[PDB]
Symmetry: D2
Subunit: 296 residues, 4 copies
Amino acid sequence: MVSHLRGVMPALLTPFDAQQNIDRASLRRLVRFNIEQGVDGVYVGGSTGEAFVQSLSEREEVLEIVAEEAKGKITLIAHVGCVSTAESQQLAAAAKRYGFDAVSAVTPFYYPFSFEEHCDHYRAIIDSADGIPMVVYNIPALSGVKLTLEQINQLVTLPGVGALKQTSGDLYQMEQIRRAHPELVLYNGYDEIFASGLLAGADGGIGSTYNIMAWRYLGIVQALKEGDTAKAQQLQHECNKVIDLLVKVGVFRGLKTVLHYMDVLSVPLCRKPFAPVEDKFQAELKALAQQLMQER
Amino acid sequence: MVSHLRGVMPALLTPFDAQQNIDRASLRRLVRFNIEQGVDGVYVGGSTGEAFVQSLSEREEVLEIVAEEAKGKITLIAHVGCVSTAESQQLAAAAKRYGFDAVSAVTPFYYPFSFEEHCDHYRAIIDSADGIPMVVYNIPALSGVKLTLEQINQLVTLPGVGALKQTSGDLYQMEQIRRAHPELVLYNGYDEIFASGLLAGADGGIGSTYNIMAWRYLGIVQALKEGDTAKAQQLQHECNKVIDLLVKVGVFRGLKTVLHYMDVLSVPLCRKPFAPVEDKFQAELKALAQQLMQER
Amino acid sequence: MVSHLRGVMPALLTPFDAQQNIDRASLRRLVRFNIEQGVDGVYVGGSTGEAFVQSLSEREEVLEIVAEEAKGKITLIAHVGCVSTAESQQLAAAAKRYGFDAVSAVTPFYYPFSFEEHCDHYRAIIDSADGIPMVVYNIPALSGVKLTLEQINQLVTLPGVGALKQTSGDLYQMEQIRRAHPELVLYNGYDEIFASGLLAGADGGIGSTYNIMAWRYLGIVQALKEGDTAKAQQLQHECNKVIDLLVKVGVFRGLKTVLHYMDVLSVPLCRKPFAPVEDKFQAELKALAQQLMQER
Amino acid sequence: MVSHLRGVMPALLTPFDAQQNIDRASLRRLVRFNIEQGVDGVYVGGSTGEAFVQSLSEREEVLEIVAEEAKGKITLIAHVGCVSTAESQQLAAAAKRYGFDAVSAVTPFYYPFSFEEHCDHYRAIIDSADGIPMVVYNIPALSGVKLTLEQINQLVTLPGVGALKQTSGDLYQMEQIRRAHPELVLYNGYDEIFASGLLAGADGGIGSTYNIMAWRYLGIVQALKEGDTAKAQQLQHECNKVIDLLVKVGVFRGLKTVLHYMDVLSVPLCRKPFAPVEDKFQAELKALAQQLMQER
Ligand SMILES: [Cl-]
Ligand SMILES: [Cl-]
Ligand SMILES: [Cl-]
Ligand SMILES: [Cl-]
Ligand SMILES: [Cl-]
Ligand SMILES: [Cl-]
Ligand SMILES: [Cl-]
Ligand SMILES: [Cl-]
Ligand SMILES: [Cl-]
Ligand SMILES: [Cl-]
Ligand SMILES: [Cl-]
Ligand SMILES: [Cl-]
Ligand SMILES: [Cl-]
Ligand SMILES: [Cl-]
Ligand SMILES: [Cl-]
Ligand SMILES: [Cl-]
Ligand code: NA
Ligand code: NA
Ligand code: NA
Ligand code: NA
Ligand code: NA
Ligand code: NA
Ligand code: NA
Ligand code: NA
Ligand code: NA
Ligand code: NA
Ligand code: NA
Ligand code: NA
Ligand code: NA
Ligand code: NA
Ligand code: NA
Ligand code: NA
């Protein structure tokens, strides 16, 4: 019923300009760039999208622009999650108006909420999504919400939930989820274990580093499907060499900087309090961009 | 230079109406109620104020209303903190325009920031505060940011920082901070250890339960000053009986409900995804309100 | 029924010789030294006693020596806890034979045990203690066992349990325990919050730094009893200056080194893998010993 | 130089009798049973071996018995780790006398040790091992020691270290270790992610559930080598159905109970404070044993 949601989808970055306003022109180029990488969809306004340093009107603006460029070409998932249920509902209804294929919401964070409150939160957003499915988004490292398997089981069986974005390194739990829900769309969230996450039960992934090297992750899926165990390991080895660097420099700004050297983004800035990239990393980030372009 | 910031100050709740909009009339009554409890100041738009389910315009609206009722009567501290530095700066400049005595900012959260990024974040807000001092706000349990003593030492010595709101149960660290900064204004943040936090080095406190029983905390300060060890323990014992209940029912909504039964708030609702109080707790919450009113 | 267990009791260190065997002569001097500090008792074979790098026969040897020097002079508590229930029972029966006033056992650790298994573990040790009361020992930072209030409530109401050694910095929980068990003997375990822990509900303490400056902690009890709030804070301030140093140098070996400079221990070594004190700290540790001796 | 250490090796359980003494006859049958499963080696006296509820003489007794049955047939690794360095050295020298192929030591736990102290601890044990290589054993969930990649890098390059037993679910770190040490023998420690751990870089595994179904894990290695991605996932799916049950009943006692129903162990008891299996699980554990025997 929602198998059209399976696949490999970049967590879209939100380009900003030299004054940290939204860079609309570069955003549109970034969407077309990802489309031309062969991805199955894009995930807009997520953690990687710097959602939580943007206003609601800014996030809606980004959602509508992406729909203009991508609707009917690749799958469109709108991350609508806020701490506030009402704010999340507003973005869900906007995503519906704009033609998105699905919505998604991080577990509301900062304040402790009971599990029933989390459930009611998802139900309300599903209501406002007005018929497009919900992608539950579990990211314990950032949210501080550590859901049990049984809690995950209750969320992904809520009426309206069509998928789970599982940004967790616990691949025992990944397998348990697959075994309990053989048909669930299950995205691996940590790029650095993509190959192992697929083997454990994920049938796709949503990741930030897909914005600069989606073909590698698409290649890992293909290798595992074909039985080329060694090819999958070698691709993941190269992916993690890049992730090691991005972690050193700062992930979001490192990816924006690589995309700038690939002539995709005019300005590679993140919003404060993210600092700019340190000058001493620029040489290696440019070399990475050139390597990746030649790799294609 | 900033000793006028010392004392006992409620973490102001933000009243909402039956549709979860800001209840401006009840907010104004809540400010006057707290003033008439004898508090030294109020802390507006903090964690207890449900800041992170409100928009910037909503938070500014609350700041200005509180300044109208309280400026020149009690000390006014504006919690301006957001994840975004620019958003925090906007609220800092607003707080300055409205006549606040100080600003405050939680450590930016959800995303991991380096310590230098945290420092630069506070510097930027201090700049926008345009001459009123900054109250660094440390709440590891909710922020996920666990600052070391040495990091706290660097923040509270930033030019412009006049105080620390220490919402931590580590009273070794509390004492270390007092010993390193004998003149620092140092607020105990966990009401349930108020008496022990003062003994460890705090010279005041900012707390959510002060909204319904500030005289008890004022009484603890007095007992310790006078040497009545037993009186302080007995007051804290009674404070924690109340905190036990509020934790059972949900703290914010429990306090709003007690204030509703005290004829301060017309509507005791928190914003979703906070649920309403369960009916089975109403009897005990009303009895608590009556007890507290008679206690005065 | 067990009020004779209340008070201030050093966590006895276990002296070793230049080859890391038990130094029996220095152990006997350490017991008499602590007695002559005015302490209410001693706690033998605990965490501070390096119990978990000693064999059962070594621990029994230490228990019997201490009983020889201290029985009938000060209260004698034997820490008998091991991971193994049978091993703990052997030390409990030994402590009974040797004339101890009480036994104690850390929550068994390394392996995860259910709460019922923890309860049954204490019951078995209580049985082998053959009529002397049990001191439950909660030290989450080292054991990895974080007991809830309700679990603590069930343990301290087990038949045979006469006290709780609460080595936790959560002074909300400390107060909750006091309020639930107004007669329970409740030892503050973290010396660096002694004064705040007493105010929160502890009626005594068991601590490692008591071995070199028990009079300070005895002085804090007296100050709080007399209502001298400032004196308690000043004593704790000085205690924590010492704890800061001991943490820098290594706590156990730092205390053994101070005691060596006080002519109590012939050799200040801990067992491997504890390293020896670094030469650069020796000057300050000797100065501390001289300061403490002159302080008396 | 130490490639003879690669492979799939059960974490040997230590059989006990009805009075919880070592069951020597059943131990000898368990060794031969594992040999006849086709394993590459056995890991003796580890966490699964209930090492930390046994004395040194008991552990030496088990080491020597296993060497008698297995030396020259399969690879022999002796887990010699204690908190005490001297105790670990005693077991290392014993393992050398008995003809073991390697020693291993968990990171010393309960007390906090500096990283240099950990390094010196391994060096001392390596010295006492007198020429057989060391298998560093990292199990953060039980030890409370969370080693960084850089710390792991320094340990596995110590002279004498030939392998790493990586009982961690972080398969980013697993890959980082493989990439940094392309020749290191690297055991996956969590059976429930075996297939994903191999894909991430492990070249073998040491696991407790191997004692009852080693052929499955051997089958996963073969599937991945042959490129049968689906077969590996299906075997791991079945392995985790069993692990789910064992976690419900208690892992060690569940495995001992399955082995009892397989006529390998005469008595399936663990030492207190491990409780016995609850009667309500016996039916399912016997059915599992029969299933596994028929599976062969
Ligand atoms: Cl374009
Ligand atoms: Cl538009
Ligand atoms: Cl929850
Ligand atoms: Cl539900
Ligand atoms: Cl009014
Ligand atoms: Cl207004
Ligand atoms: Cl930080
Ligand atoms: Cl700085
Ligand atoms: Cl003497
Ligand atoms: Cl003797
Ligand atoms: Cl437990
Ligand atoms: Cl019980
Ligand atoms: Cl046999
Ligand atoms: Cl033998
Ligand atoms: Cl460490
Ligand atoms: Cl080293
Ligand atoms: Na940008
Ligand atoms: Na698609
Ligand atoms: Na989450
Ligand atoms: Na991913
Ligand atoms: Na309200
Ligand atoms: Na004031
Ligand atoms: Na914080
Ligand atoms: Na407070
Ligand atoms: Na010594
Ligand atoms: Na006594
Ligand atoms: Na404990
Ligand atoms: Na203490
Ligand atoms: Na057994
Ligand atoms: Na072998
Ligand atoms: Na470890
Ligand atoms: Na394994």
